[PDB]
Amino acid sequence: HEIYDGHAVYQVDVASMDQVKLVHDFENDLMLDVWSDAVPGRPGKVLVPKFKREIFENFLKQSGVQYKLEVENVKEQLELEDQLLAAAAAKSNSTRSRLSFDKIHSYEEVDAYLQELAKEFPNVVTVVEGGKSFEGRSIKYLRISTTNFQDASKPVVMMQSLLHCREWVTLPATLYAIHKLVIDVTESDLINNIDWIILPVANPDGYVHTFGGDRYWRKNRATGYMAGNLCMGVDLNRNFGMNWGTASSSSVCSDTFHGRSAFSEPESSVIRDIIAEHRNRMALYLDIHSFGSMILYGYGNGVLPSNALQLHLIGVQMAQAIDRVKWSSNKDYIVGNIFHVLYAASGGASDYAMQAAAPFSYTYELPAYRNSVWFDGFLVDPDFIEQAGFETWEGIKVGARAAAAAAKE
Numbered sequence: 001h002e003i004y005d006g007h008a009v010y011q012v013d014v015a016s017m018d019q020v021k022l023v024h025d026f027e028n029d030l031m032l033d034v035w036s037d038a039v040p041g042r043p044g045k046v047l048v049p050k051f052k053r054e055i056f057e058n059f060l061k062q063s064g065v066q067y068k069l070e071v072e073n074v075k076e077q078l079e080l081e082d083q084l085l086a087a088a089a090a091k092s093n094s095t096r097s098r099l100s101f102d103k104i105h106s107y108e109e110v111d112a113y114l115q116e117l118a119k120e121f122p123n124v125v126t127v128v129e130g131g132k133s134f135e136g137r138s139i140k141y142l143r144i145s146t147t148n149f150q151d152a153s154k155p156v157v158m159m160q161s162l163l164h165c166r167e168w169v170t171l172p173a174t175l176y177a178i179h180k181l182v183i184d185v186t187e188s189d190l191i192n193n194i195d196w197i198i199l200p201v202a203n204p205d206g207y208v209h210t211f212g213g214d215r216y217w218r219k220n221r222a223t224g225y226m227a228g229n230l231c232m233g234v235d236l237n238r239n240f241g242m243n244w245g246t247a248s249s250s251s252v253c254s255d256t257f258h259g260r261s262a263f264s265e266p267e268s269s270v271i272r273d274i275i276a277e278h279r280n281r282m283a284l285y286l287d288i289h290s291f292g293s294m295i296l297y298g299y300g301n302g303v304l305p306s307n308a309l310q311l312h313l314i315g316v317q318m319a320q321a322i323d324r325v326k327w328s329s330n331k332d333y334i335v336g337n338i339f340h341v342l343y344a345a346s347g348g349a350s351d352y353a354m355q356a357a358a359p360f361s362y363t364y365e366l367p368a369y370r371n372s373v374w375f376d377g378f379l380v381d382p383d384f385i386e387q388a389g390f391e392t393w394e395g396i397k398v399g400a401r402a403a404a405a406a407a408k409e
């Protein structure tokens with residue numbers, strides 16, 4: 001039935017830096033799905049196929065690297081999520097013009113919703129198609145403004161989600177931002193003094209594919225990269241022009257494949273064109289991902305930007321605002337450089353935006369919500385959907401106001 005029947009989730013615990021490199025390269029050459037990188041003090045998670053389980057733990061054993069079996073068959077966890085999301089969708093009063101926060105919405109429902117918003121709120125909302133995905137799907141975003149992007153004195157705040165299609169919890173967060181800026185405006189300063197760009201579904205082809213098929217897919221759906229298309233798709237968070245190809249995979253079978261060149265994919269190209277059009281006054285750029293409970297910045301390569309101190313300061317302000325309203329079960333937000341906290345990475349969206357436009361640019365890593373069955377992962381429990389949105393919006397508005405208050409530059 002599933003391509004995940006027999007797949008197991010492992011937790012790798014590394015003691016030193018020597019092992020961080022060891023485990024990292026091994027995972028890459030075996031082309032494993034690395035959910036989170038291993039580092040001393042915070043063990044990582046990796047999805048290992050049934051036909052590679054013996055080879056995988058064989059290497060760790062002879063290398064002296066601790067590991068241990070979290071989930072023997074991820075299929076059971078996938079089937080539960082379907083069961084939990086299916087029941088939430090049945091009880092939901094969600095409609096075409098009003099998407100609720102009690103279920104996960106598909107690409108089609110988000111696409112229709114955006115268009116309905118521009119009919120009911122034409123003075124502040126403007127729906128625009130930034131382009132077409134590889135498989136031809138229409139990728140549209142919102143431009144929220146009371147001055148119709150006409151007053152160039154107002155700063156712009158860009159926000160996006162679903163770049164990695166399997167990170168489903170990112171969509172609620174960006175959808176909540178639309179809800180508070182359009183539907184339920186309780187804070188007039190955020191709409192009057194700031195112009196907003198929101199892109200809900202940055203990877204429509206992958207997102208649709210994760211809905212009926214490969215749940216754990218993250219790349220886009222680009223073909224023509226291998227004979228008979230045995231392997232396909234490009235990691236869009238490695239396809240951006242900031243130091244492209246320096247810290248990513250060269251194999252199309254890898255989940256971190258950078259592509260032919262920088263902005264070779266249509267999904268990343270459309271984002272580039274949006275950034276370019278508004279680079280003259282873009283104050284803040286946010287690439288919302290899942291999973292980690294961290295706010296990162298920098299440049300994936302380790303080198304820090306000139307305004308590093310300012311970047312970290314605003315990051316801490318956004319983190320503290322989220323931690324003040326968090327779930328007791330969940331942990332506090334981490335702040336820092338991308339290279340320092342996780343691992344070397346290039347071609348990232350937030351890095352490029354920083355280089356061509358926003359003085360302040362972060363990559364959000366939303367919390368992995370735990371429950372009775374699963375722990376940390378990409379699966380969504382319908383009870384965290386609203387909290388995921390509300391929690392993040394606390395950090396976003398604090399950041400938007402703080403970043404906008406950098407009109408002293």
Ligand SMILES: [Zn+2]
Nearest residue numbers: 164167289290
């Ligand atoms: Zn991601």
